[PDB]
Curated annotation (Swiss-Prot), chain A:
GO terms for biological process: canonical NF-kappaB signal transduction; cellular response to mechanical stimulus; defense response to virus; immunoglobulin mediated immune response; inflammatory response; innate immune response; negative regulation of interleukin-12 production; positive regulation of canonical NF-kappaB signal transduction. It comes from Homo sapiens (Human). The chain holds residues 31 to 818 of 1041 of the full protein. This is Toll-like receptor 8. Belongs to the Toll-like receptor family. Expressed in myeloid dendritic cells, monocytes, and monocyte-derived dendritic cells. It is linked to Immunodeficiency 98 with autoinflammation, X-linked: An X-linked disorder characterized by onset of recurrent infections associated with lymphoproliferation and autoinflammation in the first decade of life. Mostly males are affected; carrier females may have mild symptoms. Features include mouth ulcers, fever, poor early growth, hepatosplenomegaly, lymphadenopathy, polyarthritis, and non-infectious enteritis. Changing residue 358 to A: Abolishes activation of NF-kappa-B. Glycans are attached at residues 45, 53, 68, 113, 200, 238, 246, 311, 315, 348, 369, 440, 475, 511, 519, 569, 609, 681. Residues 1-747 are extracellular. Disulfide bonds join 6-14, 134-140, 210-223, 213-220, 408-438, 705-732. Changing residue 301 to A: Abolishes activation of NF-kappa-B. The keyword Membrane applies. Changing residue 503 to A: Strongly decreases activation of NF-kappa-B. Residues 701-747 form the LRRCT domain.
Length: 747, 746
């Protein structure tokens, strides 16, 4: 039978299915099993029956906004390798866990007592996550770790105790440890004996102990007087394998060089949210880190201080392996050439992160002198013209996304000037720069008329982001100096397009021989001056969303009838959010014959002429989601041989015509979800020549469940080739007796 | 029995009800019937037969998407005065219209032929609207106007022919004409005999004839060469009563002063979208308008020309009665004191409009030397730091809305600097200005830290609009120099608020003795430094929408639970668009006790503690719309004696608890629309006292039309005083036979 309620594909995915009990309906060879997000309020020896090969179970957030597991529920398994209990409001570690477990996550529970009766028999444990049980203003109790609880686990590699009230590094920790997470534990003092016996440690996280609480975006309790963490100079002595060390928000004003004496493999050092300005300026510790790749010094600013310049010690010149340097929230006015002199001969330093410094001015010519910089991140500054709340599985101190969009960075050397003040680009702005492939000028409040001379000193820009400005496109030669331009993002430039009475000029689009992708979204374009057509021989993708094609294509106006025809290479066109009630036949027929993909979604369409699809022989995806459409042609096979994906969700369709679904041979993905369908006839499904369809989305329709759905329910069993996602969401709305029942639950 | 399908109140509003045809169910006392925006295809002599009392009928836009009207269909109606048929795709003026008609609207149809058989029989016509039949790129025919068609309408005071192709003014127009609209008619030439007989004309609209087509946001056909309209020197001679004249977009280059020799009453003169820069500079015609109140000179710019200065003729000093001058779209770089000299002795000139000129700099002291300027409109320029597509019923050339928001302007002198470049306000920025009550700094890209000195030169601002900037609130004394400040709008300053690691200070709010209305909307406020509370002893209304209260009030954080409690005078509070799935009990309890009106609408709320309304004895309106709420209490009368309006629309409410409609004695308006209610049973109706509800909104609920709905239908008949609106939209879901039908119809 069709897999229900789980999607099996060997893993079974039951997540977020509103299950009130563990499924007895589970498969046979099911191994990975995810029950997360369901409503299960009870667990037992009965609920899991017994099964075969299960190598994993995810019980997370059962139920959803606790859980009762009786002593010895998971008991007879012996196969159970990994078990995830997060967010179930557990007052205690469940008594009677299996001996098989190598992975256990108790994260985000009420467990205040870690005891031998819950743990010490777990000898096979590899990774154990106890994080986020007692923290912030949560009413909770100090965490008691029984003496030698972890001592019994001689295979233990990772241990995470973070965001719990500890006060001391637990003693008698197994020497097999690789990674140890102590973050935000209220530990004031680290002694010589705390970490002494762990010679295999590659990671130690002490962050958030004695935090720097000024301007905290969370409840923050400092050590007495706002004191630094106290780490004995021999604390790290036997730590020879250490790679990652997280000292963030330890309130450090001084860093003992002797900490790093026995730590030759050190790679990533996190010093964020401390008071390190002095140490950054002088910094004996910098001499001790020859293999260090990533150094994060972010948010060390002196409160209320705004110095003219940043003070970097010459000892930075001794990190020979340095790859990225993060200095955010240092807070200084100006970056001069000599200030970065110690970084310039570092062979591997490809990334400098200057975000959120309120920097007014920079001598850009310094970046040239650097050995090889790939990413120059200046976002969120003052640069002006040249003259539960926290993801427990994520880094708490800084975001992990790429600094620069990967699609932009792949082109080459990237300069990100976003969220600054450069409101006018003057003739010398970009002089003395490296050869910039990827440039981000977004959110500079730029109101200027780009004339074609502005980027001439960096003529090689491949990918240009001008989004969220005020640009006034009054010149046909704008941006044409960039010959190699490939991607251009003009989004959120609506300021001038909105005013009927100012001139508007898009003609520059045609000059580029390499332009591939162009984003005109959210510009409110309803009118252009003298040239109504967009023309490019190169252009591949055009994003036109958030404009007014309802105005451009108004029935009484023929000037814009051809607006997209001149893009002769175009395979992808996004027409969404143009407030279209209908598209004039002529206008639709004037869309490029080359189109493989067309998005009309989230308009007001009450009419669509299906016949017109005959003029688009390469059309693959047609996206009509989020409109008002009632009508479906019964003829589709006559208008397209190429259609693959058809997305109709969030429309008004109450009727599938006889011979609709299966008569298009090329159709794979059909999306009927969130429509008005009361049923599906035997006539809708035929099938003379078999359907290539691999996916059919029916969820969120008011199916009337009587014997009239019998044929569809029959069709589903006869085609298991066709998957209908979210079976738990394909639901009888009628009659009153069957309400809420899944369509496959009907007998 | 309540009225249906119409809402009778005597007029019937039947509009937008999806009617297939004229209802028979309309009351006989009914005078005016509005059938606009329905699905009715066919009008015949039996359509309105049951109604002889009809005076005014609105058939506009039927069907919604042609309309077939038989000959003499409306004939049997002896009392019909006003007949509005617009957007009906009518091929002809309907035959045999009743002679009683005073007002006829044929706007926006396919009628290309104006004939005696349709028009000339109606002697009582006052207003006749023919506009927008053949225009733009529409496929349409040139308009044939039969010689003498209007000659027989001796009562006709208004004729609108605009947006048709006339090619010349119709001869033989009646002398009763007051207003004549000829806009966009393709009339090249106005002769001396075109208007010679209209001695009662108050308004003449000649606009859009020989239009200026450069950068037009509509299909535009210029006269050959782009020539000016040709108006004979004597064309206006008998027009002595004219008040309004619209010459916009006639491609005028010179204006013949002689045209105005005979019109001593001229009040409003529209010259927009012409070639008039030369005239604006010399301008003999200004000698001729001592009674002109309103002069629109907008968009006379020379294409491609960005002169340093605007050049205003000294003859502007001859307009003694001028109230408002509109100079948009002249396009010049710098405004100097000397440039406005001729305007400065004009006693009544309250409004100056400089919008969309790309002005770089203004010598601001010039505005004082004017007699009295109430409104200085500088919006949409380059000012930097100091060193239906077309609604046929509206004005085509400019918007008619007030330049300044009336709520601001009412405080006093207004300066609107919005949509400019003043990104940093310097010490002298506002020097030598008049005493400014109403100030708009919106969308200036301002990133500065307001420190408390920036407004020192205009300390009397009572309404300040700071919206749509980059403002960095890093200083506790910000804005405190304005001690009379009543209204402060901070909307859309999110730039810095969204960065967790920069300091944020809202403490300045408390200083104001007179602060009434503060709008913090759409700032994405999730974190503050030090002071976590908003405090004011004055503030009446706080708009907090579009922030993150969901983060501020997060269960693990105690810091913001008092956030609004220190606003002691607070009555209206808007919590909408905060992504709230629920409000902690103590945080709700910490809302100001004085609230009359509380909006939590358009959040994610899954939960509401109704018992908490006990602490709000003044609470009148509670707006819960657009949430997830399932629950309502059966005890509500225990928790409030004060609740008047309760808005529950767009939630999931499966059932009403027992006697809910009779529960609260203060409750007048209850909104249950757009919910999951399948029935209202005997229980919701069961209680000792009676419903005092004057309104109950049920529309959009999936009602079950089986017999058990009958009980609620009796409750309806019992109380006719309880208004349930949109009854065509209160609709049976189950079962299939009754589906699509109003529950009132079963
Ligand atoms: C102090 O500084 C140290 C740095 O030394 C930080 O240590 C890191 O902590 C983060 C956050 O917990 C870790 O990130 C997480 O890693 C998990 C493990 O992944 C490893 O193994 C898997 C195999 O399953 C690989 O896929 C992966 O590449 C790694 O090899 C991931 O499971 C986590 O994934 C997260 O996102 C994905 C979605 O993209 C989800 O599927 C997950 O559920 C989860 O949300 C996450 O990436 C990181 O590994 C730690 N570093 C090291 C070297 O171990 C501390 O976090 C920091 N302390 C504080 C308080 O900030
Ligand atoms: C202006 O308009 C352009 C539109 O072109 C936008 O830029 C594009 O942004 C879209 C995101 O909407 C990008 O498309 C996405 O790329 C992701 C990254 O792919 C890279 O890496 C993967 C492997 O990890 C490679 O397969 C790929 O070749 C790239 O190297 C994909 O992961 C995304 O997939 C998502 O949708 C697909 C289906 O399409 C699913 O299969 C995925 O599960 C996932 O949901 C997606 O394809 C696109 O790359 C961007 N183009 C450019 C030129 O940058 C701008 O964002 C827009 N500006 C604004 C302000 O909105
Ligand atoms: C050339 O220049 C002249 C100015 O001299 C313009 O003439 C004006 O044209 C506009 C647009 O038609 C007229 O505005 C409309 O007036 C209607 C009549 O209002 C009278 O009656 C009402 C109530 O009885 C009074 O309140 C009012 O004072 C008048 O006595 C209104 O009904 C119209 O309102 C419409 O829109 C509004 C707002 O959307 C709605 O509230 C209404 O329901 C309705 O839909 C509208 O206000 C104006 O009256 C004309 N001026 C004069 C003095 O007569 C020309 O328009 C201009 N030419 C072009 C082509 O732009
Ligand atoms: C930041 O927040 C502020 C404060 O809320 C917003 O400013 C308010 O905006 C609202 C509308 O959004 C204004 O309310 C409206 O006022 C109109 C003016 O009414 C005056 O004049 C009429 C008669 O001429 C009198 O009846 C009245 O007492 C006033 O003297 C009303 O006409 C409006 O009423 C209509 O709509 C409302 C529903 O909104 C109904 O209640 C009415 O029955 C009627 O249908 C409306 O009440 C309010 O006056 C503004 N306050 C101030 C101080 O200006 C800002 O807009 C906001 N900023 C941003 C960017 O959003
Ligand atoms: C300060 O200046 C700004 C910018 O000019 C003013 O904002 C503008 O206000 C008008 C009038 O409210 C807005 O137009 C309106 O749109 C609404 C929303 O649909 C519509 O119902 C009205 O018919 C009206 O046309 C306009 O959008 C808005 N412009 C921008 C860019 O926001 C603001 O009013 C000024 N402040 C004061 C105190 O006057
Ligand atoms: C240029 O900089 C802007 C602003 O920093 C980047 O915009 C961010 O993009 C990511 C991905 O879309 C989002 O998570 C953020 O919401 C955006 N920030 C804001 C506030 O707009 C943009 O991605 C950058 N462009 C390139 C080419 O990397
Ligand atoms: C408003 C009339 C037509 C005009 N459009 C523009 C524009 N888009 N940018 C400018 C920049 C500088 C100077 C003038 C202009 C003008 S003048
Ligand atoms: C990032 C550390 C804390 C800071 N917050 C701000 C702020 N809101 N505005 C500034 C304006 C100028 C200079 C410095 C600042 C800083 S420094
Ligand atoms: C720099 O990195 C490269 C690999 O990217 C490596 O071969 C080289 O040894 C590194 N240089 C230093 C000094 O670490
Ligand atoms: C574009 O700008 C340059 C520099 O101002 C100017 O020389 C050129 O004439 C402009 N081109 C257009 C289309 O006006
Ligand atoms: C059309 O698009 C493809 C994909 O970008 C590209 O290979 C080809 O060069 C383009 N053709 C032209 C003429 O630009
Ligand atoms: C605010 O800025 C002013 C500058 O005039 C300064 O004097 C004051 O100290 C600042 N206030 C605070 C408390 O930050
Ligand atoms: C409280 O509100 C009213 C609003 O009209 C106002 O009259 C009164 O002065 C305010 N009280 C204080 C102390 O500001
Ligand atoms: C409502 O809030 C108060 C807490 O102050 C409590 O007495 C009552 O139980 C709450 N109701 C619910 C359902 O939580």
């Amino acid at each position: 039978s069709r897999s229900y309620p789980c999607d099996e594909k060997v893993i079974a995915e039951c997540s977020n299915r509103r299950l009130q009990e563990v499924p007895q309906t589970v498969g046979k060879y099911v191994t990975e099993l995810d029950l997360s997000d369901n409503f299960i309020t009870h667990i037992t020896n009965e609920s899991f029956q017994g099964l075969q090969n299960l190598t994993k179970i995810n019980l997370n957030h059962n139920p959803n906004v606790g859980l009762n597991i009786t002593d010895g529920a998971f008991l007879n398994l012996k196969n159970l390798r990994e078990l995830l209990l997060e967010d179930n409001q557990l007052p205690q570690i469940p008594s009677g866990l299996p001996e098989s477990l190598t992975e256990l996550s108790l994260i985000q529970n009420n467990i205040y007592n870690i005891t031998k009766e819950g743990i010490s028999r777990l000898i096979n444990l590899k990774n154990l996550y106890l994080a986020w049980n007692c923290y912030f203003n949560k009413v909770c109790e100090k965490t008691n770790i029984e003496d030698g609880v972890f001592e019994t686990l001689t295979n233990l590699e990772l241990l995470s105790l973070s965001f719990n009230s500890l006060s001391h590094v637990p003693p008698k920790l197994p020497s097999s440890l690789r990674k140890l997470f102590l973050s935000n534990t209220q530990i004031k003092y680290i002694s010589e004996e705390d970490f002494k016996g762990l010679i295999n440690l590659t990671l130690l996280d002490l962050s958030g102990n004695c935090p720097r609480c000024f301007n905290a975006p969370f409840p923050c309790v400092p050590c007495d007087g706002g004191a630094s963490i106290n780490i004995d100079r021999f604390a790290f002595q036997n730590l020879t394998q250490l790679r990652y060390l997280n000292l963030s928000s330890t309130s450090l004003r001084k860093i003992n060089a002797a900490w790093f004496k026995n730590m030759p493999h050190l790679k990533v050092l996190d010093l964020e949210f401390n008071y390190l300005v002095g140490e950054i300026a002088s910094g004996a510790f910098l001499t001790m880190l020859p293999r260090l790749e990533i150094l994060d010094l972010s948010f060390n600013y002196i409160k209320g201080s705004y110095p003219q310049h940043i003070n970097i010690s010459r000892n930075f010149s001794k990190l020979l392996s340095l790859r990225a340097l993060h200095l955010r929230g240092y807070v200084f006015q100006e970056l001069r050439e000599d200030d970065f002199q110690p970084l310039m001969q570092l062979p591997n330093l490809s990334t400098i992160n200057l975000g959120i410094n309120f920097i007014k001015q920079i001598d850009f010519k310094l970046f040239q002198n650097f050995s090889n910089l790939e990413i120059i991140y200046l976002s969120e500054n003052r640069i002006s013209p040249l003259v539960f709340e926290f993801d427990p599985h994520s880094n708490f101190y800084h975001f992990t996304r790429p600094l620069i969009k990967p699609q932009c960075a792949a082109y080459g050397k990237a300069l990100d000037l976003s969220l600054n003040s450069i409101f006018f680009i003057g003739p010398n702005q970009f002089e003395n720069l490296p050869d910039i492939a990827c440039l981000n000028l977004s959110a500079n409040s730029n109101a200027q008329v780009l004339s074609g001379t502005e980027f001439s000193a960096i003529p090689h820009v491949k990918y240009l982001d001008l989004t969220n400005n005020r640009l006034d496109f009054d010149n046909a030669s704008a941006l044409t100096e960039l010959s190699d331009l490939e991607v251009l993002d003009l989004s959120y430039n609506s300021h001038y397009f909105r005013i009927a009475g100012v001139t508007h000029h898009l003609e520059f689009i045609q000059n580029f021989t390499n332009l591939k992708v162009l984003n005109l979204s959210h510009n409110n374009i309803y009118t252009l001056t003298d040239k109504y057509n967009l023309e490019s021989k190169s252009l591949v993708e055009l994003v036109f969303s958030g404009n007014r094609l309802d105005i451009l294509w108004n029935d009484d106006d023929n000037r814009y009838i051809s607006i997209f025809k001149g893009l002769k290479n175009l395979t992808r066109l996004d027409l969404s959010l143009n407030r279209l009630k209908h598209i004039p036949n002529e206008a639709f027929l004037n869309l490029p014959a080359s189109l493989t993909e067309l998005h009309i979604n989230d308009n007001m369409l009450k009419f669509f002429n299906w016949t017109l699809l005959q003029q688009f022989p390469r059309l693959e995806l047609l996206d009509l989601r989020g409109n008002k459409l009632l009508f479906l042609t019964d003829s589709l096979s006559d208008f397209t041989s190429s259609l693959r994906t058809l997305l109709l969700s969030h429309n008004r369709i109450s009727h599938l015509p006889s011979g609709f679904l299966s008569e298009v041979s090329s159709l794979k993905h059909l999306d009927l979800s969130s429509n008005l369908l009361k049923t599906i006839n035997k006539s809708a499904l035929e099938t003379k020549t078999t359907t290539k369809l691999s996916m059919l989305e029916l969820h969120g329709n008011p199916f009337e469940c009587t014997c009239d759905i019998g044929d569809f329910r029959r069709w589903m069993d006869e085609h298991l080739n066709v998957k209908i996602p979210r079976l738990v969401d394909v639901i009888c709305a009628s009659p009153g007796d069957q309400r809420g029942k899944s369509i496959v639950s009907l007998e």
